[PDB]
């Protein structure tokens with residue numbers, strides 16, 4: 001029936017160091033994975049993912065309907081016209097199973113010039129009451145900078161893999177303006193499971209979320225130990241095995257654009273599984289005005305005829321497009 005994808009485990013610890021040859025050997029493994037299925041697991045990453053999962057569970061399982069309305073994005077609460085990205089994405093009992101909480105750069109405050117200018121895709125995070133969820137905000141903001149650090153190191157690997165100096169991507173990935181987001185997704189156990197929340201793929205597979213390419217430069221994902229992801233290959237969809245100690249990494253469609261599809265954005269989908277689990281992506285986005293001149297690693301000169309694409313315009317279009325194709329999450 002369904003084969004299993006080759007997803008290598010890459011020790012990324014050299015990318016935090018100064019052994020340049022060891023970093024090249026990591027870059028080679030990133031290149032090979034990016035040209036095969038497009039996924040790899042980053043191991044020896046140094047992030048306490050046990051505390052991540054525990055604090056996230058405590059939040060999902062203790063927030064009340066009252067608090068969810070207070071935090072809801074505008075899709076679920078007409079009063080919150082300024083919350084398009086950041087806030088709570090409600091489940092709909094009997095109809096929609098998944099629920100999530102999304103937050104952005106903690107440096108996006110009312111004092112931030114992008115917030116003053118009302119620039120699209122920039123928002124101030126909303127948080128639950130500290131007394132009802134003690135330590136949650138402190139944990140979540142710290143985690144943002146923890147995975148920001150991991151992501152910066154990974155971008156050095158991708159740069160070296162493509163033959164560029166190690167700051168080629170990372171120089172556009174800055175704490176003061178990154179549009180990167182964390183999403184804390186709960187997939188619940190439900191009995192009976194609402195049929196409306198299950199989609200049937202063309203090939204008969206039951207899905208929670210249909211095929212898509214990620215709107216990101218790269219995606220840095222922690223999931224609990226329940227198998228669910230599939231990646232499309234020419235020979236059909238292949239199962240991605242779960243590993244709840246590592247981060248699963250793949251390219252988004254901005255990487256595909258700027259490399260002239262040398263590193264494709266892998267198409268993937270989420271199988272339906274009736275099990276309580278967590279999916280915690282960090283979407284590595286650059287700044288609103290970040291532009292990287294596209295290039296083609298296949299050509300000696302590296303010349304490409306693709307237009308440079310501003311990351312802000314890419315992100316605004318891509319988020320809307322994904323909602324329109326696969327539905328409001």
Ligand SMILES: CC(C)[C@@H](NC(=O)[C@H](CS)NC(=O)CCC[C@H](N)C(=O)O)C(=O)O
Pocket residue numbers: 084085086102180181183185209212214215221270279281283319322329
């Ligand atoms: C496949 C996983 C990453 C996860 N899916 C997802 O997170 C899906 C597909 S990548 N992503 C989205 O809907 C885009 C969220 C963007 C976010 N609100 C923002 O403003 O930045 C899942 O488990 O459903």
Ligand SMILES: [Fe+2]
Pocket residue numbers: 212213214268
């Ligand atoms: Fe995805």
